[PDB]
Design a binder for this molecule. Structure first.
Ligand code: ANP
Ligand code: MG
Length: 283
């Protein structure tokens, strides 16, 4: 992480709050004198050593990536207090809360563009040997041009040697087997979230029932007017055998084909006469 000079940082307004303190919008003056919009996260006063380590540790992971669909770290302030993390500004906030404001208001192709961005960021993250472990719409940020970027590296780990039940693969729930294929499972959940405009995966089902139902082969049902190609992709991401799930590169390719031939999205799926809220996948 670049150590920033605080004279180049100007804080505007508080836009949200996190575990470690506040999130503000503001401006960063770059060494070239160009000024850019940024988000500024500050570590609360009277922080513990653990809080500082976790706060800056997440920035250290973020900083190892330089990709259009991973949130960009502009730098940190550590040599004065409060400690700060400065990232690119994402005008439309978190993807799940953004989509809930706009139910049924985007085209299928717009939604597919969002999904393609997320998949591309994940392809790079997995190429770099990281497993995110908390890939969920609430951890995707979306900018003024609807570009979606992976964020929140608080649970991320290098592949070597509370976790969000609704987004976690059955094998990771069962015995902590986290791999890039468990992030592909999570991607399938994000795909359902996007096509559902921010509906909660598995609604408010008891966690024990989410675990049992999924292990028994039950899957989230097709969102309203969901293209067949996209529901099939969800089912593929949710294969019981992790070896049968697509790789992120394959997901990017699948979505690129749908963008290239939007007519393919005209084939729709539904399941109105099904016996239960979750759908048993035969496959
Ligand atoms: N780079 C950014 N640009 C604009 N807003 C941001 C940025 N980073 C965080 N925020 C906003 O700050 C608020 C608090 O951040 P955060 O608590 O990280 O998001 P919430 O996470 O949506 N999802 P989660 O905390 O995982 O349940 C949210 O409304 C974010 O969308
Ligand atoms: Mg977050």
């Amino acid at each position: 992480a670049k150590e920033l000079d605080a004279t180049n940082i100007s804080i505007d307004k508080v836009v949200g709050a996190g575990e470690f303190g506040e999130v503000c919008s503001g401006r960063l003056k770059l060494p070239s004198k160009k000024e850019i919009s940024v988000a500024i996260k500050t570590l609360k006063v009277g922080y513990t050593e653990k809080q500082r380590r976790d706060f800056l540790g997440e920035a250290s992971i973020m900083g190892q990536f330089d990709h259009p669909n991973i949130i960009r770290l502009e730098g940190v302030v550590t040599k004065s207090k409060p400690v700060m993390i400065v990232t690119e500004y994402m005008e439309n906030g978190s993807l799940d809360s953004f989509l809930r404001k706009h139910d049924a208001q985007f085209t299928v192709i717009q939604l597919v563009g969002m999904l393609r961005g997320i998949a591309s960021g994940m392809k790079y993250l997995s190429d770099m040997g990281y497993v995110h472990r908390d890939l969920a719409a609430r951890n995707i940020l979306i900018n003024s041009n609807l570009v979606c970027k992976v964020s929140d590296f608080g649970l991320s780990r290098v592949l070597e040697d509370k976790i969000p039940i609704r987004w976690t693969s059955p094998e990771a729930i069962a015995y902590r087997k986290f791999t890039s294929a468990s992030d592909v499972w999570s991607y399938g959940i994000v795909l359902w979230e996007v096509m559902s405009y921010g509906e909660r995966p598995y609604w408010e089902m008891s966690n024990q029932d989410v675990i049992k139902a999924v292990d028994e082969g039950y899957r989230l049902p097709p969102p309203m007017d969901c293209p067949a190609a996209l529901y099939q992709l969800m089912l593929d991401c949710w294969q019981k055998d992790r070896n049968n799930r697509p790789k992120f590169e394959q997901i990017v390719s699948i979505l690129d084909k749908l963008i290239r031939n939007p007519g393919s999205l005209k084939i729709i799926t539904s399941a109105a006469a099904r016996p239960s809220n979750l759908l048993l996948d035969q496959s």
